[PDB]
């Protein structure tokens, strides 16, 4: 219990007995040695070594999703698009993301606490002081929870009998 | 270890046949008299959990 | 067997094979006490986990 | 400017089922004074007795009357191509419709088309402050 | 200052069906000059002969045309959320509806939309002097 | 041998998606909630009598299903831990019978 | 949200005959707007004269349309297969069946299949506050 | 009003036969606009030449559309339990009927049921006023 | 395009048997609305009591309304040739049959033939990320 509990992993034999046969060795939990937080705040984000996994496929997936971007037109001071033009802003660029994660949910992510938060999308210029920004630059922030699975159940069992 | 079912760890089972389910039902307070013999306190209300639990 | 401390302690032992701390191990065990009646019925310690044969 | 009430921005992209083609984003323009319309709803009840109601499957459906552009062929706009919308109206609102299709097309006259867009969701992108996940 | 006929409050609470998330009474605002419709008596009549009728088992109405909050979801206004619903006209008179439904949603252009609540019973608060019990 | 079985049979929840909040399950997800857990193991528990247990008193209030979220307070639970409680009773032994034996003489 | 008569999930569980290969209980969308219907009463009454009747075995069925999976052959949603199906309606009532087996199967389009299940039991869960034990 | 064909109340009183339980007259209501049909003449007549007639021993029959009750196994409203109905019109006529079994039932989809019911007789109440004893 | 219910090519390959001539696959169009339907599973089941079920050979079967090819007796759309046929969907299904025969054939006006064929197997193309071997 003392070792699951700070982030180690332990193995047991599938069988119990004095005859001295031999028998094979199974995981117990599959944890990574993760515990604290860069700011030292406890939490249990990586502590199944399947979120390490799922962390480098939704970064994998949502890099290319993002390819699409590449070499478009923009507009920023005045959002306007004229006629004819092949653009996009910030706000259809906003509402896409969204759209590309509920798509995802059940397969890399789990439901959004509020979606309306966990995603959001900002221009180079407000970021930075005047004259400082460049242009056709963008910062992304997003927050996700990866799926939920079962993880164990307790039983009550509370026997009774039939008098008499 | 243990059995072969209960090893891994996914499931914890408890046995106890004094436990209930259900909460409290209501309550009810009975008084009257006692004798010397008895070794309740005198003017405390108190649990009570079984018959056997009287004369004493 | 028949000394009362040796069983005493192999209850102790079953009851926590059932115990609720841990993957459990059950089991059951079989004693025998032997006397007068008088004798045999002072050996009833309310033992779930144990089934003790009287004898004369 | 919290108020007027009226469309700002419409983007369509098109993918040919045949030959697989695609044409990024264009922005189109409205033929007339009449806006678009939207059920985000994917369930449709009816009404039984005694206030039940039956419940059943249904549709996310987009009215849409855009300009025909002079570089996409009339067939595309009607129901020999998918389909890719967003519509971004003056109170920030932005609608976003993909893998959509056309169904029941009415004749047009070349410029003006009215298509009726249906698809499993549409994804509604409210102001800030919005209430509800 | 009696005779004036008009609406003068509309309060709805939403409820997600899906998630439960509860909203509370925000009150609305009409789009335009047409007023709401009721119908209180969960029975429905028919012809036959002899001046007989058949009585069946109905339902109670209420067509409710408001403004959408700028805050609250498009969807939520059609059939993905249960609704209770309060208007108070000039008079007095105030109707009040618990657990209704919205059955058969019409496209809308986002501001305006037009619902059909079906509850089990509505109830009516005359103003005082009622003669009936 | 009820805990055993138990066991064995609960095993097939075993790194299954379980979904809490939102209890509509998309199209082609592998997955399951509450309801439909408690379901499957009313069934099983039913279908036991005569060879584990007898007749359930009461088969809807002798099995109740929890996630852990609506036992422990606000910000303390844990994701996709269940608790549940589960009552029966062995088969029954046998009966008690009273016989009121009482010829008659006279003949209607 | 409590009386809306619908379907809310569908899970069904192949097991291959030939092979012996499951595949874990898959969510599935009904086609259109009818619902499943059930029988759970495994004996049949047959009206002699004078209020008699007379019993005879039967069985208990389940008619569930559902819309295939275009991950499973079309062979299984017929007669080629075992069948463990669930629904849950919206009110919170949940039906399980286990050991399925179709029966005398017609033909399909592609996407549209109409499965007829008998099975020995058919067990059911009334929503909390049940009466009958 | 006297001339309104209608239904007012119905009472049920169920029996599981396999345990013996009794639930007391709940209430009910009805799925849709039909009424229930009667039969109250337990013999049967069949044309022979030139007018005569053979007489046949048939029995008396009920026809109750219900709504189901969510706190009742859908079972015992099939032919798992025993019956014991009355049906109250709106101008007065009261109709009893007790120890009737179900016949034949067919798939329900949870909420409607259409019970047949048969019973060795019927009891009629009309109105204050009758001509027959 | 994945979600599209509909036939993309139709093949059929005659081989007349009175005279051995082979005509290479030819492409057909559809008459009507309608489409194909299949049914792969060769046994079939029937409901015996108490859950069993009995088990009967049968066949695979199919129905093809396809148009008339102006250039090809009608006799041969008819039980007078061997047929072998293949059916691509939109979304990627490919059905495949060899060696089947026309049966129980019926008048037709000379365009439209709705030909029913059978054949001891027919095989399944899923599209790619199929479940089962």
Request: hydrophobic share 35%; proline share 5%; net charge negative.
């Amino acid at each position: 219990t003392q070792l699951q509990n700070n982030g180690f992993v332990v193995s047991g034999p599938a069988t119990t007995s004095g005859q001295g046969n031999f028998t094979s060795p199974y995981i117990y939990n599959d944890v990574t040695n993760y515990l604290r937080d860069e700011k030292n705040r406890p939490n249990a984000t990586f502590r199944d070594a399947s979120s390490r996994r799922l962390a480098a496929a939704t970064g994998v997936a949502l890099a290319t999703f993002l390819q699409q971007f590449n070499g478009l037109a923009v507009f920023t001071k005045n959002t306007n698009i004229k006629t004819g033009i092949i653009g996009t802003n910030l706000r259809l660029m906003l509402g896409k993301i969204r759209k590309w994660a509920s798509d995802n949910v059940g397969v890399l992510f789990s439901e959004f606490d509020n979606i309306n938060e966990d995603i959001q999308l900002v221009s180079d210029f407000d970021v930075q002081p005047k004259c400082v920004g460049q242009p056709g630059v963008f910062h992304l922030n997003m927050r996700y929870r990866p799926p939920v699975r079962g993880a164990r159940i307790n039983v009550n069992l509370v026997p009774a009998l039939f008098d008499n | 270890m243990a059995q072969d079912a209960l090893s891994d760890g996914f499931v914890r089972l408890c046995i106890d046949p004094s436990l209930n389910f259900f909460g409290e039902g209501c309550k009810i307070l009975v008084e009257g008299q006692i004798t010397d013999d008895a070794t309740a306190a005198e003017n405390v209300v108190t649990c009570v959990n079984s018959e056997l639990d009287l004369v004493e | 067997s028949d000394d009362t401390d040796w069983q005493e302690n192999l209850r102790d032992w079953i009851r926590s094979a059932w115990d609720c701390s841990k993957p459990q191990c059950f089991g059951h065990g079989y004693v025998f006490n032997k006397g007068t009646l008088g004798q045999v019925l002072a050996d009833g310690d309310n033992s779930a986990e144990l089934s003790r044969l009287a004898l004369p | 400017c919290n108020k007027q009430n009226g469309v700002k921005n419409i983007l369509i992209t098109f993918t040919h089922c045949d030959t697989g083609e695609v044409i990024g984003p264009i922005s189109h323009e409205q033929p007339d004074d009449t806006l678009p319309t939207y059920k985000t709803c994917a369930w449709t009840n009816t009404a039984l007795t005694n206030g039940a109601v039956m419940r059943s499957a249904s549709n996310a459906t987009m009215t849409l009357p855009v300009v025909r552009d002079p570089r996409v062929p009339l067939a595309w706009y009607q129901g020999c191509a998918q389909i890719d919308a967003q519509v971004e109206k003056f109170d920030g609102t932005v609608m976003t419709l993909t893998e959509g299709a056309v169904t029941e097309p009415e004749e047009s006259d070349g410029r003006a088309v009215t298509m009726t867009i249906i698809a499993a969701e549409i994804d509604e992108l409210l102001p800030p402050g919005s209430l509800a996940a």
